[PDB]
Design a protein around this nucleic acid. Structure first.
Length: 191
DNA sequence: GCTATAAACGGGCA
DNA sequence: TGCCCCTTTATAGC
């Protein structure tokens, strides 16, 4: 609630919007059995090899594979992603699979924020051509590939920003603080 | 729906 | 190894 200015000298804190984590349930799973018995689980192996299962709290989607690997998507924080993963693991256990909870790992963190002024994207693409891809007839946002940390930002004329590719939220924050002074150089008036 | 980004998974191609 | 999918999420123009 007090913004730590040593991590956010802009004074702006990106909001986390999506976490991807993995965990190894460490046993073989009968996906047809799981899809039949579990209420909110779909399975079309012709299309995709996973059982797709969804829970309401934390609101998430798991991809559960016959190998015992699981991907958990959609949570708003690292803690919520781990808590959701444990709930999916318990669902599988309650069906009689002896599932464990091995090597849980946060794999991707997506954040977004709003610098609250419009941005002349053409100018940023021009001066940062090596890191920028801006093709407004293909997609209206500028794609910025930051090297340190290795992070991708989507930058929009509105001042909204998407920040993805982090394994640690401090990478999300560092990328935003690296880009904020650059964005400010291309601020334009809002009609 | 399409177009754009990252990551994991199993799985098609080379 | 790479390519192409696969779900999720913010963003936003056709």
């Amino acid at each position: 609630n007090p913004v730590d200015l040593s991590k956010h000298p802009s004074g702006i804190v990106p909001t986390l919007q999506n976490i991807v984590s993995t965990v190894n349930l460490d046993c073989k799973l009968d996906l047809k059995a799981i899809a039949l018995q579990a209420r909110n689980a779909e399975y079309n192996p012709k299309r995709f090899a996973a059982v797709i299962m969804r829970i309401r709290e934390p609101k998430t989607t798991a991809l559960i594979f016959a190998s015992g690997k699981m991907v958990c998507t959609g949570a708003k924080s690292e803690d919520f992603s781990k808590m959701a993963a444990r709930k999916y693991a318990r669902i599988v256990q309650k069906l009689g699979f002896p599932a464990k909870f091995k090597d849980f790992k946060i794999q991707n963190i997506v954040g977004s924020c709003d610098v609250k002024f419009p941005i002349r994207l053409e100018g940023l693409a021009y001066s940062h051509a090596a890191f920028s891809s801006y093709e407004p007839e293909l997609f209206p946002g500028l794609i910025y590939r930051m090297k340190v940390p290795k992070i991708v930002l989507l930058i929009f004329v509105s001042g909204k920003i998407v920040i993805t590719g982090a394994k640690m939220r401090d990478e999300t924050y560092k990328a935003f603080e690296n880009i904020y002074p650059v964005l400010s150089e291309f601020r334009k008036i809002q009609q």
